[PDB]
Amino acid sequence: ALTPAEVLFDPAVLPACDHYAGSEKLMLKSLALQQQLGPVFDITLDCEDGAQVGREAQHAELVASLLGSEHDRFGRVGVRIHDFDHAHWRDDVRLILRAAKRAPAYITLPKIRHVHDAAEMVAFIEATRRELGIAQPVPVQLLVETHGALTRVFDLAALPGVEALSFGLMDFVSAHDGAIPDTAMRSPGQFDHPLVRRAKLEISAACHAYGKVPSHNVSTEVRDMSVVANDAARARNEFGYTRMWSIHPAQIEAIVAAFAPRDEEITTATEILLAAQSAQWGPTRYHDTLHDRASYRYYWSVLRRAQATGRAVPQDAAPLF
Amino acid sequence: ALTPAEVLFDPAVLPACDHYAGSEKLMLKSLALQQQLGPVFDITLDCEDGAQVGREAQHAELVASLLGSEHDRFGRVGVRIHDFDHAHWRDDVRLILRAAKRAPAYITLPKIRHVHDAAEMVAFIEATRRELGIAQPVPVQLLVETHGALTRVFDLAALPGVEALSFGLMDFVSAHDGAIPDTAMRSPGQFDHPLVRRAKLEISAACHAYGKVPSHNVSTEVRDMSVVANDAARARNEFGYTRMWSIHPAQIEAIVAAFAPRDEEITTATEILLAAQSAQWGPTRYHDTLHDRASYRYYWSVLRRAQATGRAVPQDAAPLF
Amino acid sequence: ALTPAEVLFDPAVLPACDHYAGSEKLMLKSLALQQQLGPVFDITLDCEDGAQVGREAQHAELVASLLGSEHDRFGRVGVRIHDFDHAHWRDDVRLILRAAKRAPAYITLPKIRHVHDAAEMVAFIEATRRELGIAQPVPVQLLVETHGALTRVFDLAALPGVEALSFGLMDFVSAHDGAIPDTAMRSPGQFDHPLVRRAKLEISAACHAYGKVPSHNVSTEVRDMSVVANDAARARNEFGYTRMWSIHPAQIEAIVAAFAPRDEEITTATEILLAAQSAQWGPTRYHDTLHDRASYRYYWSVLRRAQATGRAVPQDAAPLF
Numbered sequence A, B, C: 001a002l003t004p005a006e007v008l009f010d011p012a013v014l015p016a017c018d019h020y021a022g023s024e025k026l027m028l029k030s031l032a033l034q035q036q037l038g039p040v041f042d043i044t045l046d047c048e049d050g051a052q053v054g055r056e057a058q059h060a061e062l063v064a065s066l067l068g069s070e071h072d073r074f075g076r077v078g079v080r081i082h083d084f085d086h087a088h089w090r091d092d093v094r095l096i097l098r099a100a101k102r103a104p105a106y107i108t109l110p111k112i113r114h115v116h117d118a119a120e121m122v123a124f125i126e127a128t129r130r131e132l133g134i135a136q137p138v139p140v141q142l143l144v145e146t147h148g149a150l151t152r153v154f155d156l157a158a159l160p161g162v163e164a165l166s167f168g169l170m171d172f173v174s175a176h177d178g179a180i181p182d183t184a185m186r187s188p189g190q191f192d193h194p195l196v197r198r199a200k201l202e203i204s205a206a207c208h209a210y211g212k213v214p215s216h217n218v219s220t221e222v223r224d225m226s227v228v229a230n231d232a233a234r235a236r237n238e239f240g241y242t243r244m245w246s247i248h249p250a251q252i253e254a255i256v257a258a259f260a261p262r263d264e265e266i267t268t269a270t271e272i273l274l275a276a277q278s279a280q281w282g283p284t285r286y287h288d289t290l291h292d293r294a295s296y297r298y299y300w301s302v303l304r305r306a307q308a309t310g311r312a313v314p315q316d317a318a319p320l321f
């Protein structure tokens, strides 16, 4: 018989939590925690908004000293540098790429205003790593947190060296100069305020269109993890994000859990697909619902991801592989 | 006095139901039903997802044999062919246009990824019908059900030989590789899931912008017609669709009814417009509400459609024509 | 220590109410009311939909006679002229600019279909005022109330001589030829109908992206001011509009109040920023919530606007200036 892989029409993957640390104490504790939990979350060593101002050179060296060190056990430690209109952004790239025992897992670019700004920064990173004789290119992630970036967000998603786009909620709200209430930086405003909801969906649609990872902003709530876990669920199940920032180690497990695979999907996919197979991939009826190749795709996507990620697939599903 | 037609600033129309049949038995039963009900719905003879795979040539000939036959009583029978990246799509066009006693009412193109893909297919259809000496061009309808089509959906709406765009809900959800839950293929998820709601509104706005018909996806619910009728109402009254696909003959009357004209609108339009006329088309007050030429347009659109479609217009409305 | 102005990353302002009058009696009463209340609202002397048809030349002269007259006390009186596809639009510009003792505060262009249409009209206004030896250029405001304008609404926001975009709700609904129910011209439909909500957010995002004023459509409700006041609140707090049209003098105070500054914001901003300052503009904790430079921006925007507009700022905030 025919397999779904050969009859059905036609994805980006990074760890689901991006944990930010902007000071040495937090970096070291995060790194230690990553060793305990394993690489279920990335760590971003932050030079920008997560850090105080004034020690820019010293800070980039601190960051560089941790990359590929004894604390970086999995190679899942990236960085965020300064913005294009900042004096130290090239110095961040040079200091960090020169001194890091291993290159950062990715470089996060904040406050992109124009498409050319991002491309130029991506290009400088490539050039620098090329001359330092670094083996592979360094992935870049872009913040979409200005008017300019949101307007051209599809152009950003399309950029070659860019693996993900992240929403900058606070900067985006602040960018409206008070026209959007600060309640939009908290939940549920950050999901329900029409302009913020609109921006999040643009970023998400753009990422999916170009096979990039849509990364959700942090929850600034540092007490109620119940809120944080709910944010992560809405980002995932309503907004189509596949990753989310963390700003406190207690957020990490709530976020990772929210993005865990739903194993409940696997038996359903198996049943539907086996039946589809028997109907020669023509339309079928399942539980008062019509299915055809357009929905089969979904369930094959579900089975494919499950088997790939070494999740339990029913023996019945064998003739689909 | 002055008529609305001469003072007011400044539409596409197809049957409101597009009934799909992908097998001979269903095609023949649909055709028979169309003869009974008259052409209140179109029929699309389906070569793609509504049909099993493997008999592609035989299937296109079956389809071609029904077009303009004794069963095709009104010329309101179209087809859906294979996609641009499929081997048999040109063969579908040639086999069907060559053998059909009368050309299809339209040709539906599934899974458009790029604007050039669609244009090229539209162009091949024109060329083929031109060489076969077919008298008029064959209208094309495009599925918007990929990332590429949604991104450039306004460019699609603008294409010259394209009369309508249809939303492919299942393919669109599947296109997100699991990021959108399968609950978004069912109601109310298919209206309330932010990314699906977003896609539907883009397609709709694009169609209206370029005078094309926005055609809504089928309800996959084949038991509860109450659900199907509600879907059709939301597609119409919230999303601005003017047509909807049917996948089961029991859906057809629910869909056709949902898109029926609201005669309640006609007396209101008459009253408002006659009063506007007397105020020399300056602003008026009607029921605690201010009206001016911007709203008069709406009510003239309502009267114009009613009189055109031979619906009952009050004798009082005479000085508006 | 360091001030927010020197560490933080990175606005258009017009009166919050745009009161329309399309007849001499209403213009004169509006002008008198503006003298009483002071310039808390603009007045637009209307030649288009707010006026009856047929006296076009006489009407433009009436309008021109009031600009800069004894009734125009503050220079906050603009006009709306006819559309690009109208015969009298150039005549409106010439008659009005030639005869007005002082130039209009702005010129509102209705029913823009294409970007070039608007640019061309903006250019004619510049040319005319230049040859009449008028000292400064006349600001233009564009109506976004057609399909063509909404599609290219970001291109419109970007136009050099354009200070604001206004949503034309009734024309926009009417533009869909009945596909959008007339209930979308009333509240809550005008906020909740998905296509109208979508259009309003596009206009708003575009204006903010290019530093223009987003101006909300009028409430056509002329009895219940409670409705009007609620409309203004949703336009402001959900949709990000900073101005709203008025069509009845009783609407004016409800609209102006809805857009009044929230003084409650000032102490919060002060507290957060003073603390940020002490942490060397690194991240801080405030009330179970994490803050960093991305949110500080918001609160600095709040303080800056308060001090500028001569509102009461706490003595504690001194080291932030």
Ligand SMILES: [Ca+2]
Binding pocket: A049, A110, A143, A145, A168, A169, A170, A171, C294
């Ligand atoms: Ca940010």
Ligand SMILES: [Ca+2]
Binding pocket: A223, A224
């Ligand atoms: Ca609590």
Ligand SMILES: [Ca+2]
Binding pocket: A294, B049, B110, B143, B145, B168, B169, B170, B171
């Ligand atoms: Ca489909």
Ligand SMILES: [Ca+2]
Binding pocket: B223, B224
């Ligand atoms: Ca039931």
Ligand SMILES: [Ca+2]
Binding pocket: B294, C049, C110, C143, C145, C168, C169, C170, C171
């Ligand atoms: Ca209007």
Ligand SMILES: [Ca+2]
Binding pocket: C223, C224
């Ligand atoms: Ca009342």
